[PDB]
């Protein structure tokens, strides 16, 4: 019904506000914790024949260090999206001068659009999130250890201490649900901090390739 | 699929010396029974049981297109070890298949086409009982099945 679709729009918004917080974008403490009724107050309950249309749910968050960088989280209203639809979004990113943005797809992306995202590496980057992949925050599962993306200064100092070439670390492929979560690009290195029952803690480094 | 869903369960025979499968009611008309009342008279020994009737029905609709004996033998001979150049080379070939290599313990000679009709209908009858579930599937290891 429209109570379920109002509840779904409550998770998706909440879980995304945790992405933006974990990627280091400025997110107010009030936006992180929203009671459903407070959310139902702001965006008004039933989406269908109702005030939330799946648009105006868009999120603009600015990075902590750079106020200029920001990002968008777009919610398409269509079941599937196509190059003509993305070209609308990319025309909006051009309009407002940003670079990075997210897309939350209801069902799937047309096979012609997926390559269109890759078609722009440098100028604009876009990321496909299925509507389900955000229904739950996998960072909070018990199986997934704490991941930390590492600065370039720290990877140089790392590889000097253990005297490693970059390709001698373990890998985590860029198609990995915890790579997408942290918006990681090929060549960055991530720091897995997980508690162990022998050492009591252990720190693994994964390269992203 | 659209056809698989509508038909239900179809029965097929895999004969010796034939490349691929053949529908069943084609095999009874090949043996000289034109009507579907005679075909279903050998398979289903009591017509007052509709549960079997509904089991066979979708296998008549698959064989509906070939209504004649000599059309059916040609349907078989197309699939033989090698396709006959001339048609009547195939009908002569398929008839030699049903006479010899078909159930030879019943009989090898001529009018046995009737003797082969009941018993071959009895394979198709006993395959229904295990489809309806009125009998137990035979046991591979039951040592009365061994020689």
């Amino acid at each position: 019904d429209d109570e379920e679709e109002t509840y779904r729009l409550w998770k998706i918004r909440k879980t995304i506000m945790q992405l933006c917080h974990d990627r280091g974008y400025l997110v107010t403490q009030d936006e992180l914790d929203q009671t459903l009724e407070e959310f139902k107050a702001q965006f008004g309950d039933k989406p269908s024949e109702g005030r939330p249309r799946r648009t105006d749910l868009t999120v603009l968050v600015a990075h902590n260090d750079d106020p200029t960088d920001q990002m968008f989280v777009f919610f398409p209203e269509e079941p599937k999206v196509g190059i003509k639809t993305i070209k609308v979004y990319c025309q909006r990113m051009q309009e407002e001068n940003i670079t990075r943005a997210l897309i939350v797809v209801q069902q799937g992306m047309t096979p012609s659009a997926k390559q269109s995202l890759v078609d722009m590496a440098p100028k604009y980057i876009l990321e496909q999130f299925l509507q389900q992949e955000l229904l739950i925050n996998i960072t909070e599962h018990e199986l997934v250890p704490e991941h930390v993306v590492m600065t370039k200064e720290e990877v140089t100092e790392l590889l000097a201490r253990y005297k490693l070439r970059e390709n001698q670390l373990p890998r985590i492929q860029a198609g990995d649900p915890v790579a997408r979560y942290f918006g990681i690009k090929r060549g960055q290195v991530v720091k897995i901090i997980r508690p162990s029952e022998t050492a009591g803690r252990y720190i693994t480094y994964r390269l992203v390739q | 699929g659209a056809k698989k869903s509508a038909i239900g369960q179809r029965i097929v025979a895999t004969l010796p010396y034939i490349k691929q499968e053949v529908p069943i009611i084609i095999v009874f008309r090949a043996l000289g029974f034109v009507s579907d009342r005679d075909i279903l008279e050998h398979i289903i020994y009591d017509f007052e049981d509709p549960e079997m009737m509904e089991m066979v029905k979708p296998s008549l609709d698959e064989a509906f297109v070939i209504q004649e004996q000599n059309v059916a033998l040609n349907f078989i001979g197309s699939r033989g070890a090698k396709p006959g150049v001339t048609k009547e080379k195939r009908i002569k070939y398929a008839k030699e298949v049903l006479q010899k290599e078909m159930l030879p313990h019943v009989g090898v000679s001529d009018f046995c086409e009737t003797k082969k009709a009941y018993f071959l209908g009895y394979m198709v009858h006993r395959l229904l009982l295990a489809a309806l579930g009125r009998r137990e599937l035979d046991d591979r290891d039951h040592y009365g099945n061994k020689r």
Binding site: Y162, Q168, A199, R201, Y202, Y205 | -
Partner: protein, 353 residues
């Protein structure tokens, strides 16, 4: 037992048997008959093990674990019990009956393979055959599993064969690619470790502060467990008392880390050296009288573990990256080693000189 199986069987003929949720009526019947017959052979087994005299030789080989198990005594004296094929009670090889002797649709205990005779009284003809059907399943498994367990043993070796602990102590396969930063994440060979309890984990919050706290307020209890020079020393110095409140703060910080690493509160850990044995060995070698007050200064217990923990080095470096990677490798050991060597336990339980 065989009379309680006839009632369960009679209840199912009249349909009075109600299926357990998630179970076919055949699944609930095959369970209730197994619940009865197991209690039978579990009762007659324990009734036979009570009867054995102290001079019995079976009891001599079982009690010391030399050979045989308590379940072999049961089958010799008491009952051999149900015989199973593929985890199910004996099936129907004929049509609806197990052997030509039995009547069709006999689910009773005798027809389906329960052997009520013991190897000593000897098995009856059919029980001999069913017992042979349950033993064939043992011979077959032993012939089949060995060839699978040997094809897996060969695959695990060829994939791992070249992984080795390099002189950096980093574990690296044949290419130099890093499998682990330290072997096993603690960097310790597996043959010298033992089992141990943490003992800071899983007491109550009220008892924890009772065992590890070192209350100096009494001035009486301290005279009891500590020499006359030292208790006058501990009461006077405000600094000494400050250092001991710091140590107990580090035990709470570690008690909060343990409850993060060990949910379910399993306290049994594997660590390199046994502390409770070596504290126990240094009581006997030095002839310590635990009735007497100890001479060991409660600070030199604290300053001695801090100076110890620096001399246990898994990771060698001065870098802030090397420091952080040792505190993690020795984390759960320094936590354990500050539980047992705590300044209070040395004053009360151990009384080391």
């Amino acid at each position: 037992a065989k009379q309680d199986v006839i009632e369960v069987i009679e209840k199912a003929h009249n349909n009075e048997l109600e299926p357990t949720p998630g179970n076919t009526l055949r699944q609930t019947f095959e369970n209730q008959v197994n619940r009865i017959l197991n209690d039978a052979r579990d009762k007659t087994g324990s009734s036979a093990q009570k009867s054995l005299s102290e001079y019995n030789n079976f009891k001599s080989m079982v009690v010391s674990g030399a050979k045989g198990s308590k379940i072999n005594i049961s089958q010799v004296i008491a009952v051999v019990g149900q015989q199973n094929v593929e985890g199910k009670r004996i099936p129907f090889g004929f049509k609806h009956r197990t052997l030509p002797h039995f009547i069709k649709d006999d689910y009773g205990p005798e027809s389906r393979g329960f052997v009520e005779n013991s190897y000593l009284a000897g098995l009856t003809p059919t029980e001999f055959f069913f017992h042979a059907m349950g033993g064939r399943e043992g011979l077959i498994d032993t012939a089949v599993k060995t060839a699978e367990t040997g094809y897996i043993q060969r695959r695990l070796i060829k994939s791992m064969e070249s992984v080795m602990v390099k002189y950096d102590a980093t574990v690296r396969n044949s290419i130099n690619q890093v499998v682990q930063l330290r072997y096993g994440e603690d960097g310790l060979a597996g043959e010298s470790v033992e089992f141990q309890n943490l003992a800071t984990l899983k007491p109550s919050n009220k008892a924890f502060e009772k065992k590890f706290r070192f209350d100096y307020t009494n001035e009486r209890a301290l005279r009891r467990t500590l020499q006359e020079d030292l208790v006058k020393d501990v009461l006077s110095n405000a600094h000494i008392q400050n250092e001991l409140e710091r140590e107990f703060e580090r035990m709470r910080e570690d008690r909060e880390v343990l409850r993060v690493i060990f949910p379910t509160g399993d306290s049994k850990v594997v660590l390199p050296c046994n502390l409770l044995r070596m504290i126990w060995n240094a009581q006997k070698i030095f002839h310590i009288n635990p009735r007497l007050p100890s001479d060991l200064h409660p600070i030199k217990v604290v300053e001695g573990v801090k100076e110890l923990s620096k001399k246990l080095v898994i990771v060698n470096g001065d870098d802030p990256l090397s420091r952080q990677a040792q505190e993690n490798a020795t984390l759960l050991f320094n936590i354990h080693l500050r539980s047992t060597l705590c300044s209070r336990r040395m004053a009360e339980e151990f009384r080391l000189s």
